C-alpha cells in the first residue's frame, strides 16, 4: 500500500509497502530508491519518532499518510 515521505529538501517521495511490514524495511527502501542508508535516517509521523522493530499497524499509519525524514548525521 502507498504512503508518502517528505524530507529536508522537500522531495515528496511515494513508498509502496504493506502495513504489516516493519520500519527498517522502509529504511531499506530509502537506501534503494533514494540512496540514503538506514543509520542516518530519522523517521517521524505526527510528532512520534518511529523505531525499527514496529510496523505501520502499530502506529495506526494508513494510506497516503505523510511521514517526515531527517538526516541524523552523527558527526556532520
Amino acid at each position: 500500500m502507498q504512503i508518502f515521505v517528505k524530507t529536508l529538501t522537500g522531495k515528496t517521495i511515494t513508498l509502496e509497502v504493506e502495513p504489516s511490514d516493519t520500519i527498517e524495511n522502509v529504511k531499506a527502501k530509502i537506501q534503494d530508491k533514494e540512496g540514503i542508508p538506514p543509520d542516518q535516517q530519522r523517521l517521524i509521523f505526527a510528532g512520534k519518532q518511529l523505531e525499527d522493530g514496529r510496523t505501520l499497524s502499530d502506529y495506526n499509519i494508513q494510506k497516503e499518510s505523510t511521514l517526515h525524514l531527517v538526516l541524523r548525521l552523527r558527526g556532520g
Binding site: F4, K6, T7, L8, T9, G10, I44, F45, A46, G47, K48, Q49, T66, H68, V70
Partner: protein
Amino acid sequence: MDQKILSLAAEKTADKLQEFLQTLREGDLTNLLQNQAVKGKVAGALLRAIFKGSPCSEEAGTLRRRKIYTCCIQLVESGDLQKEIVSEIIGLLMLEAHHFPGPLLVELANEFISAVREGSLVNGKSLELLPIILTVLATKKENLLSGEECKKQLINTLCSGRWDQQYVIQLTSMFKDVPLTAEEVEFVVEKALSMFSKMNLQEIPPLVYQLLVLSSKGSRKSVLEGIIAFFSALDKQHNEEQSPSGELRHVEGTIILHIVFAIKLDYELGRELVKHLKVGQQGDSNNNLSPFSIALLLSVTRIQRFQDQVLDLLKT
C-alpha cells in the same frame, strides 16, 4: 568533434584553447546536451578544457566563461538527464568560481533571480551556485557600488521577488550556507514566514528545519513569534470552525518534535524561547501563550536541564 579539445587542454594553456573559442564561434549548446546523450563521461571531461583555457585575466575568456555558465544553468534546469552527471557538473561549476572579477557574477545572479520569478526550477540543484558566488562577491571589495551593496540588492530582489510555492524550501536552504548579517537573515525569515499562510500544510516542518538551523546564527525570537502567531491563530480558526484536524495536529506534533531536537543542539534557543513566553508581568500571559505553545513547552520538558524552569513557568 570532442577529441580536438583534449588535444588542447593537455599540452599548453591560452596558446591553443583561447584560439578554439574565437575560431569555432558556431554555438555552445548543441555540442554539450547531445554529447551527454551518447556518453555522459566525455561531457564532464569537456568542461575541464574550457575553464582551464578561459581564465578571467582577459575579457574574451571571461565572456566565453559567462556564456558557458548561462548555458549550463539552462541544461541542468532543462534536461531529464542521469543524476550522477548532474551531481558531477554542479560539483565542477562549484569548484570554479574563485578568481572571477566583480561585475560578471551580477548577470548569473540576476539570471537565477529571473529563474525564481518565472524559471522551471524542477531542480534546486541549479541554486547550489548562488551560495558561493555571493561570498566571492563580498570578498571583492572594489567598485563593481561595492560587493556588499550588490549582495544586499540581490537579497532584496530574492525576497521581494515572488516565490514558486513548490520549491521555496530549497531557496530557503540556499541562505543557510552564506554568512549574513542579522538584517538579511531577518528579511528572509520575515518574508519566508509570511509565505506560510499561502501553502499546503505538510511541507512546513522541513522548511522549519532549514529556518531553524539558519536561525541558529541570526534572529530566532522573530521566527518563534511568527510560528506561535501562525499556529495560535489557526488553532482559534479551528476552535471557531468547531463551535481539518487529523493532519493539522499531526503536523503540529512533528513541528514541535523538530524544534525540540534542534534545541537539543543549541540551548541559547531554549533561553530565547522561554524569555518570549516568560509571563514576567501577568498581561504578557494574556498575549504570550496558546494551547500550541503550551504543548511545545511540555514537550520541551523532557530535556533534564529544562524540567525546572518550564515547569516553574507553567505552574506560576
